[PDB]
Design a protein around this ligand. Sequence first.
Ligand SMILES: NC(=O)c1ccc[n+]([C@@H]2O[C@H](COP(=O)([O-])OP(=O)(O)OC[C@H]3O[C@@H](n4cnc5c(N)ncnc54)[C@H](O)[C@@H]3O)[C@@H](O)[C@H]2O)c1
Ligand SMILES: NC(=O)c1ccc[n+]([C@@H]2O[C@H](COP(=O)([O-])OP(=O)(O)OC[C@H]3O[C@@H](n4cnc5c(N)ncnc54)[C@H](O)[C@@H]3O)[C@@H](O)[C@H]2O)c1
Ligand SMILES: NC(=O)c1ccc[n+]([C@@H]2O[C@H](COP(=O)([O-])OP(=O)(O)OC[C@H]3O[C@@H](n4cnc5c(N)ncnc54)[C@H](O)[C@@H]3O)[C@@H](O)[C@H]2O)c1
Ligand SMILES: NC(=O)c1ccc[n+]([C@@H]2O[C@H](COP(=O)([O-])OP(=O)(O)OC[C@H]3O[C@@H](n4cnc5c(N)ncnc54)[C@H](O)[C@@H]3O)[C@@H](O)[C@H]2O)c1
Ligand SMILES: C[C@@H](O)c1ccccc1
Ligand SMILES: C[C@@H](O)c1ccccc1
Ligand SMILES: C[C@@H](O)c1ccccc1
Ligand SMILES: C[C@@H](O)c1ccccc1
Ligand SMILES: [Mg+2]
Ligand SMILES: [Mg+2]
Lengths: 251, 251, 251, 251
Amino acid sequence: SNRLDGKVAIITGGTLGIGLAIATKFVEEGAKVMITDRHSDVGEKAAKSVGTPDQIQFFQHDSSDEDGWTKLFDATEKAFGPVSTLVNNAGIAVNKSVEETTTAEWRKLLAVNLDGVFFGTRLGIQRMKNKGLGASIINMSSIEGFVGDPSLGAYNASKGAVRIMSKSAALDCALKDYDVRVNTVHPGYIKTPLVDDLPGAEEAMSQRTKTPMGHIGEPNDIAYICVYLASNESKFATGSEFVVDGGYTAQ
Amino acid sequence: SNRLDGKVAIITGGTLGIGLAIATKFVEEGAKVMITDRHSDVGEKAAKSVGTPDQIQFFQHDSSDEDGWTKLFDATEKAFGPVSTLVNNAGIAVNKSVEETTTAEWRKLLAVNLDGVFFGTRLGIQRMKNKGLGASIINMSSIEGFVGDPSLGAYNASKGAVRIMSKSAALDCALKDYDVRVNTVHPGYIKTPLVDDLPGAEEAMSQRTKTPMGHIGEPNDIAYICVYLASNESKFATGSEFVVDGGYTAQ
Amino acid sequence: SNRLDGKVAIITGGTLGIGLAIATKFVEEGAKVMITDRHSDVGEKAAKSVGTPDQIQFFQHDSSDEDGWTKLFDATEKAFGPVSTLVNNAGIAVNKSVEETTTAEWRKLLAVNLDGVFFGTRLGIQRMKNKGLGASIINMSSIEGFVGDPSLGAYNASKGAVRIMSKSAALDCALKDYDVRVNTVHPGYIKTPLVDDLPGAEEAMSQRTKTPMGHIGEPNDIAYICVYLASNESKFATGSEFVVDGGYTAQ
Amino acid sequence: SNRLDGKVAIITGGTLGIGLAIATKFVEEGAKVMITDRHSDVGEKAAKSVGTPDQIQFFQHDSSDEDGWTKLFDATEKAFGPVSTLVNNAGIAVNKSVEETTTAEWRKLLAVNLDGVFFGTRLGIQRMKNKGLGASIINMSSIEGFVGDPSLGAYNASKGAVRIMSKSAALDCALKDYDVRVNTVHPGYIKTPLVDDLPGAEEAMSQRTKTPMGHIGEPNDIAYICVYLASNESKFATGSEFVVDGGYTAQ
Ligand SMILES: NC(=O)c1ccc[n+]([C@@H]2O[C@H](COP(=O)([O-])OP(=O)(O)OC[C@H]3O[C@@H](n4cnc5c(N)ncnc54)[C@H](O)[C@@H]3O)[C@@H](O)[C@H]2O)c1
Ligand SMILES: NC(=O)c1ccc[n+]([C@@H]2O[C@H](COP(=O)([O-])OP(=O)(O)OC[C@H]3O[C@@H](n4cnc5c(N)ncnc54)[C@H](O)[C@@H]3O)[C@@H](O)[C@H]2O)c1
Ligand SMILES: NC(=O)c1ccc[n+]([C@@H]2O[C@H](COP(=O)([O-])OP(=O)(O)OC[C@H]3O[C@@H](n4cnc5c(N)ncnc54)[C@H](O)[C@@H]3O)[C@@H](O)[C@H]2O)c1
Ligand SMILES: NC(=O)c1ccc[n+]([C@@H]2O[C@H](COP(=O)([O-])OP(=O)(O)OC[C@H]3O[C@@H](n4cnc5c(N)ncnc54)[C@H](O)[C@@H]3O)[C@@H](O)[C@H]2O)c1
Ligand SMILES: C[C@@H](O)c1ccccc1
Ligand SMILES: C[C@@H](O)c1ccccc1
Ligand SMILES: C[C@@H](O)c1ccccc1
Ligand SMILES: C[C@@H](O)c1ccccc1
Ligand SMILES: [Mg+2]
Ligand SMILES: [Mg+2]
């Protein structure tokens, strides 16, 4: 209760799975939230399922859309006042090795997972700096920002990029006394309705050679680390990586 | 409020600075706490300053004392019921390079910072495994478990050891379904009454070439990450390192 | 002598500084080498300065140019036989924070430093797999693939991407028995004619708070680690990062 | 040929497996070598198998024996002149989890793997500093200095300690202009006569979920990275970790 009192958050890809759980817990802790998706049908339903409009709203936007990012911040501030918190959660995957990645696949994934995170981080710093908000940018950067996977080549590129670009942003914000922190969160495998629709995936993710806990996580596992990072409890954490992975990367 | 309801925690070196703040926040969140120190004069005063005995007690014990560790767990369970949470926070430093470290200094520091953490982790696993407690062992492993410092040679050895030994323990507990998680916390420089008594230290720690935020942290900065790790909010986090350092290691 | 006997190497940006030294040592160790640059005036002069045409040639190509990559491999094989070794060394920098990076700057840097490395790695795997060549792809991925720099935001993104994308490629090549290794090299600051033309840069790079050795490196420092990685001496090294930085990242 | 001309090296545990291969390649490259073991029967045979006495000798010494370390340096200098190079390779393992490690096991393993490496590094700095030797201390610090293993608890502690203590030493030597570098080498699984005597071990080590190359390494794989680190080719490498692991840690 009340751990995010006063905060105003944007959560990209906030309509499903991890993003939806972040949104849910953010509201529970007193934040106002704007969630996004490119699909209005998913997004309108998502917001109402979490709370009322004084709590949470939806804004249609593809995170790869640079100009839209500006529209999104303006809509959030109109609704709730100045934005304090940004969670760059929208992302896609391609199940190709580097060798078998088409250039179109490469460009499409980087547009969402890398360009989109850049656009959001850049704008967030500009919009949040120097306002006494206790501002926090949380970038989703994966276990696949630490280790490779032979069939996630472009995804690995994007997650390693986010991991280190976030450090750059963290450092500049700290050195300039901007009152903006930047950190990354690195989920392991998480159970969602989507993973459920991939036959055998959860079982495969749960083998001990993959996740030593022997099972995969839940959306709220990622929500709770995001609450900590969004809150003023984490006012001395910047430039760091927060891993919640069931032991995946420990072996 | 209530984030640690039902938990029973031991915090070594829990009478001052970081440990005292962990203890304070743990009680605030509903945990019962046993704090330790080798000095009874510091410890008795510390516990009363935080809460009443149904909340928090003191047990005299040097973490390097293997047999005492057993006494400590028994006293904690007598007071509060079965222990769920262990924070291995006791530690010392020597301001010597590797070259200038005496063997006596080496052995003394390893006895507290490495042997003590081993004894606590080993016993904690034995005492906590298989009880449905949502058990959590939090080992303090420093920014100096990631980077070297030319004048902290033995300290660096100890912190690197804790960092990776904790992964081992995490993995075995996960693979065996013990219901015990093991993680490390890595503070940067934190302001305490002790740092204050070291002339020039805070200023030195606050230079941008050291801590990019331009200031050092506070004890509660470490308390709040420990609350997260002790709580069931972090049930999918094991084998990982949680850094709260003002950007120190990001550059 | 003879450590690269039989090898046929492409070195992008092989006409100056680090790339030129890699080329020089590669020839000295028996490799045939094709160096590239987008500028024919630099490139033709560079090759002749190292050796004769049976040893080393130049091919004009911007590493961001996807179609050219194909032309480059064909020209190298025409000259020297099947390519065994690729050093993705071409790169650019922008001295902007994330906040102050224009979208045009972002795209331009990623085109060279990320897309170019992807194109080369992807093609190299296809062209080198399954030929008994002891093939090796060496990707230049910087100290700035480990730590952030407040004024190198896009560069940091690119280097973190290369760092982890290379692991993906390494893993897939290993799992498929392709006889291709992929590793990254991470230079610290190196003295070149270019650094010399940046007033104050070497001195700034040589402060102990930056490079603890108190001086910066030389091009041959990077050449020698590349010889090791190109050679069959390193036949069990894949998916790893090789740092040569004067201690920069150790503190 | 000649890459270690003039060098005088001590290699602890230099009589078998990895250490023996390091010794072999060091002699081939022009170094004089003193190898150690606690067992004179293994050691005398080992030296003669590599070369003559003007090349390589044996000195009986347990690396956990502090006073002996002094005897060892004196004997090496008597034979060959001032020592330039130290490879701290002696080590033991215990196949126990943290939970199941006895205190006697803990102390015994730390005595060799941690205390021994400390004693050698400390003495090496004192004996090598300020002599224009291009001195290099190479500490064997394992894949198990990066990742945990549930059945190698004490070993993990020791290897994480070596990993970070070496950074400390590297930094102090660099800052003080000692002309001593300190780096760590991190082998994955390597085939030796000992591994061969552990039924099923190589096959187990070679599963793709362990070593993605699908096989384990050979002793010379570690020898060649040590030649690079001992040589002046690596004069700008200090405080770094060199991993040769078949992809083990990349996934
Ligand atoms: N689910 C897992 O097992 C898992 C594992 C590792 C990492 N991750 C990462 O965690 C993050 C969140 O996962 P998730 O559960 O919300 O994903 P999800 O699999 O449940 O669904 C995909 C999500 O991505 C968002 N999205 C995709 N493309 C978008 C675009 N162009 N614009 C805006 N939004 C877009 C959608 O809103 C959607 O919620 C992602 O970045 C993902 O890469 C997830
Ligand atoms: N204060 C900082 O700036 C800082 C910076 C980096 C890391 N750390 C680490 O954080 C942890 C906690 O710091 P702190 O503020 O509580 O320390 P502190 O400097 O305030 O005081 C030392 C603490 O260590 C404990 N301690 C020392 N030796 C002990 C022994 N033999 N047995 C039991 N307890 C013992 C004491 O209880 C005391 O509270 C330590 O492990 C320390 O190494 C602290
Ligand atoms: N010089 C340093 O201090 C330093 C420090 C850290 C990292 N690095 C990295 O090391 C690598 C090599 O450095 P360097 O000394 O050769 O660089 P350099 O500064 O001496 O010169 C730039 C080099 O990049 C190449 N290049 C740039 N854009 C290119 C393009 N579009 N197509 C083809 N080639 C292109 C050129 O051939 C040129 O040799 C680079 O990737 C750089 O990012 C260098
Ligand atoms: N062989 C592998 O698969 C493997 C895998 C990972 C790490 N390592 C590490 O690599 C290093 C070298 O391996 P190896 O092949 O030489 O070992 P080995 O298994 O072949 O034989 C053990 C070696 O350790 C030395 N040794 C053990 N205790 C000693 C003591 N008290 N004093 C002096 N010397 C002692 C012996 O000389 C012997 O050569 C070791 O530190 C080991 O921990 C080996
Ligand atoms: C790593 C995770 O995001 C994932 C990617 C592709 C397919 C399944 C899971
Ligand atoms: C790293 C921190 O624990 C410290 C150690 C010695 C002196 C001051 C601070
Ligand atoms: C990191 C190195 O490549 C660099 C980048 C920009 C300016 C100077 C040096
Ligand atoms: C990690 C390696 O040194 C090992 C340890 C114990 C048994 C087998 C192999
Ligand atoms: Mg640093
Ligand atoms: Mg792994």
